[PDB]
Amino acid sequence: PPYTVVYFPVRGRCAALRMLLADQGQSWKEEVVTVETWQEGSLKASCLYGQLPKFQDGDLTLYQSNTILRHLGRTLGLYGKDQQEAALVDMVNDGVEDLRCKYISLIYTNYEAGKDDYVKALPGQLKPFETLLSQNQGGKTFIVGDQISFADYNLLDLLLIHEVLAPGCLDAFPLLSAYVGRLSARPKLKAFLASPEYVNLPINGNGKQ
Amino acid sequence: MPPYTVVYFPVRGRCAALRMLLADQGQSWKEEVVTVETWQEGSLKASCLYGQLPKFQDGDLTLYQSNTILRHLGRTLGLYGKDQQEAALVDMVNDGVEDLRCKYISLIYTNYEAGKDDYVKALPGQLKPFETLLSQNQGGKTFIVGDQISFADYNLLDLLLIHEVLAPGCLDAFPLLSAYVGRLSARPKLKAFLASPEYVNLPINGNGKQ
Numbered sequence A: 001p002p003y004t005v006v007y008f009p010v011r012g013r014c015a016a017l018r019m020l021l022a023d024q025g026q027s028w029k030e031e032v033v034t035v036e037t038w039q040e041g042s043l044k045a046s047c048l049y050g051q052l053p054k055f056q057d058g059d060l061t062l063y064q065s066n067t068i069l070r071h072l073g074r075t076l077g078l079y080g081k082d083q084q085e086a087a088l089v090d091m092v093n094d095g096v097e098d099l100r101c102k103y104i105s106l107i108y109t110n111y112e113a114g115k116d117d118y119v120k121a122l123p124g125q126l127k128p129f130e131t132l133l134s135q136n137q138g139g140k141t142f143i144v145g146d147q148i149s150f151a152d153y154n155l156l157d158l159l160l161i162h163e164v165l166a167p168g169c170l171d172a173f174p175l176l177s178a179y180v181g182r183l184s185a186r187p188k189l190k191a192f193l194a195s196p197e198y199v200n201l202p203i204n205g206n207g208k209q
Numbered sequence B: 001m002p003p004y005t006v007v008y009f010p011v012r013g014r015c016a017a018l019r020m021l022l023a024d025q026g027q028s029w030k031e032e033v034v035t036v037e038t039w040q041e042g043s044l045k046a047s048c049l050y051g052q053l054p055k056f057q058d059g060d061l062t063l064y065q066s067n068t069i070l071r072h073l074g075r076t077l078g079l080y081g082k083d084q085q086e087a088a089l090v091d092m093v094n095d096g097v098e099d100l101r102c103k104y105i106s107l108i109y110t111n112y113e114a115g116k117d118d119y120v121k122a123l124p125g126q127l128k129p130f131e132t133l134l135s136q137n138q139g140g141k142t143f144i145v146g147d148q149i150s151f152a153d154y155n156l157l158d159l160l161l162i163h164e165v166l167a168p169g170c171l172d173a174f175p176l177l178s179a180y181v182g183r184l185s186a187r188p189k190l191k192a193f194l195a196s197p198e199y200v201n202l203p204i205n206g207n208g209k210q
């Protein structure tokens, strides 16, 4: 620390890492960049891949949302108990990211024409996470092992945004449904999820969800 | 029997980098090849976590997701930076490689004919960040992060090799990336692997485009 998040005024790709920071009792600074400021161009040019989020951890400057999650996971002990679990955490996170990618493509490039097919395909896209839960302590703890990992925060966000896109999408999945409820009730996270800081930001940048 | 098994289609694709890594690190592995006809039968696919390959076995640990495999071999073989800060930098590089890889995969499989001109025009802007990273690490003379090779080097190396095939001369604009490709490619175990039929006789992609 100290931590700084630099991003647009949306949940988007910072939603998970914010949940992580809040639930872990960490303090951070939000540096909000408006689309108008972004269009000026100087900040963009300074960014490694010309994109946000940008993250500061003292003198360390990071880009890439999953890089930031993994860094926080590594430094805060949210990356499994050992190498085997770390691999499983990665495997979950990479699966979350694949579905997030599809979600983002839909939202920004093909929402109207593409939504019906996306929603019909969604159960098949969620099932692997239900299966993973079913294979770990009967779904009663976390997505990997006995302690929370960065992948839990990312999967939780993925599930929350999909409940908005396709209400009822988890009804067929009892372990996932219970998992969302349980994690969302963790006291610090619950307070964050209730706060205007979360509630009053849109999920995406284009008014679609 | 080797403790590593790679289960994939008969293509370089998303296994090229992890194979280079294993070869360059002198690790033994087994290749289990899945034909497109075998895949269509559906049972293997149904058994894969996300319905896709590669699948990788390290003893009884079964992994899916190409970057998960890279990170796993990175941790277990000591190719993930010297400390926590370097490990984050290695991740930042690999995540950048995979963004460009994704763009490349979309071009190859969904829009090659119509998209290629635009893609190659945009390519220097997409490679520049890696040249910038090289320029800020020991003048580009060693690796992408730090002074030891990482899994991100093998992934970046593969990304660069396949782009030279797509857009020959694309690294002429980037002297550090150019020298880097030559340098890593000359590492003895890797050089042997890259020249071997095991590598050369597989196509880069599954649809004949490159």
Ligand SMILES: N[C@@H](CCC(=O)N[C@@H](CS[As](SC[C@H](NC(=O)CC[C@H](N)C(=O)O)C(=O)NCC(=O)O)c1ccccc1)C(=O)NCC(=O)O)C(=O)O
Residues within 6 Å of the ligand: A008, A009, A010, A012, A013, A035, A044, A050, A051, A052, A053, A063, A064, A065, A066, A101, A104, A108, A204, A205, A206, B099
């Ligand atoms: N015409 C598009 C604009 C281009 C675009 O960036 N499209 C996005 C979806 S826009 As979103 S998140 C903001 C974005 N950052 C990233 O994509 C980082 C990805 C990285 N792999 C990571 O995980 O960190 C960004 O900074 N864009 C600026 C730029 O490139 O100039 C949003 C939109 C508006 C307001 C707030 C947030 C895309 O397809 N990304 C791919 C991905 O997420 O992997 C448009 O209309 O928006």
Ligand SMILES: N[C@@H](CCC(=O)N[C@@H](CS[As](SC[C@H](NC(=O)CC[C@H](N)C(=O)O)C(=O)NCC(=O)O)c1ccccc1)C(=O)NCC(=O)O)C(=O)O
Residues within 6 Å of the ligand: A094, A098, B009, B010, B011, B013, B014, B036, B045, B051, B052, B053, B054, B064, B065, B066, B067, B102, B105, B106, B109, B205, B206
């Ligand atoms: N909707 C279809 C998907 C079809 C598809 O796979 N499209 C590809 C390009 S085809 As290539 S790589 C072989 C593959 N695995 C992956 O894509 C895993 C991606 C991942 N995040 C990772 O890093 O591991 C696959 O299993 N395809 C078959 C399938 O999905 O049933 C190839 C090589 C040799 C022979 C044929 C094809 C795509 O666009 N992938 C995206 C990406 O690579 O990130 C469906 O699933 O039914």
